[PDB]
Design a protein around this ligand. Structure first.
Ligand SMILES: CC[C@H](C)[C@H](N)C(=O)O
Ligand SMILES: CC[C@H](C)[C@H](N)C(=O)O
Lengths: 155, 155
């Protein structure tokens, strides 16, 4: 579908979502649907405010993080070192969203890190991940729109 | 500039604009800058919540509306008859944003009407106008993003 179709899907969601209580799961699912990627909305200290999986997780340590709604400390602290969007980070990146013990299986795994910013303040991080298919400009447009509005719906 | 550059300009504005008091003038100016059009943010009953002019107004009746921060009653009521975005409406359209007494001078004037929607509710209208250059998909993406976020910043 055109980008205009995908932005219309996000917009339709945002237009209905006010003034119901904020739903970060719904925002994560909508972004998963239009970007075709796993989506994690991560607080400054690693809390999963919302997420949506595009591919089943066959890693017990990762499935635990979802259940706990919490990402690891060191991983989470290091996200602050990325000040702007950084896309298509591969399995060997310290920022990868794939479990390092399964690097071989996820050799084609790609990760995009999108700072969520909220008032001169870093409020969290929007993480996107998927296999094989490089993120493009349209994906970034949609990811950054999501991160921006998430930053608004966070406040 | 790419669309990604223009969306980044809107995003940069929205990211800084929280949690300062809502600034509809700033949103109108930002959209004027990235869409290259006059921008009017119009309430259900015709109040100009914000606007930004791209072309000097040489029509006293129009300059009066800006000063008054108020569009005409009948014109404003009729906007409700347009339920979805309708772009590139020409000088002969009842919805034109150009003054009808200057149709000849503004023969090339084009108007885009974008409902602002806010919770199953029509909250107002975002109007874009300019001369000669047809609005395209990128312009609509930006206009609808603006209308959606304006709908959020309205609430
Ligand atoms: C969310 C943490 C991610 C999966 C990190 N690459 C790890 O293996 O711990
Ligand atoms: C804002 C109203 C507009 C300009 C309308 N076409 C009129 O002439 O009154």
């Amino acid at each position: 579908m055109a980008l205009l179709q995908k932005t219309r899907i996000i917009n339709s969601m945002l237009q209905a979502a006010a003034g119901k209580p904020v739903n970060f799961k719904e925002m994560a699912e909508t972004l998963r649907d239009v970007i075709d990627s796993n989506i994690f909305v991560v607080s400054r200290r690693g809390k999963l405010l919302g997420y949506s999986i595009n591919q089943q997780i066959e890693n017990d340590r990762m499935k635990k993080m979802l259940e706990d709604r919490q990402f690891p400390e060191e991983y989470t602290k290091n996200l602050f070192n990325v000040p702007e969007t950084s896309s298509n980070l591969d399995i060997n990146s310290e920022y990868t969203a794939f479990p390092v013990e399964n690097r071989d299986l996820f050799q084609a795994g790609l990760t995009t890190i999108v700072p969520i910013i909220g008032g001169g303040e870093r409020l969290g991080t929007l993480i996107l991940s998927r296999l094989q298919d490089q993120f493009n400009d349209d994906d970034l447009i949609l990811a950054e729109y999501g991160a921006t509005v998430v930053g608004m719906e966070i406040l």
